[PDB]
Amino acid sequence: VARGWKRKCPLFGKGG
Numbered sequence: 001v002a003r004g005w006k007r008k009c010p011l012f013g014k015g016g
Contacts, residue, residue, distance in 0.1 A: 005016040 005012045009016075
């Protein structure tokens with residue numbers, strides 16, 4: 001999934 005990028009994915013935060 002590409003919706004949970006604000007949890008364990010610090011790569012895309014504000015940009016997500």
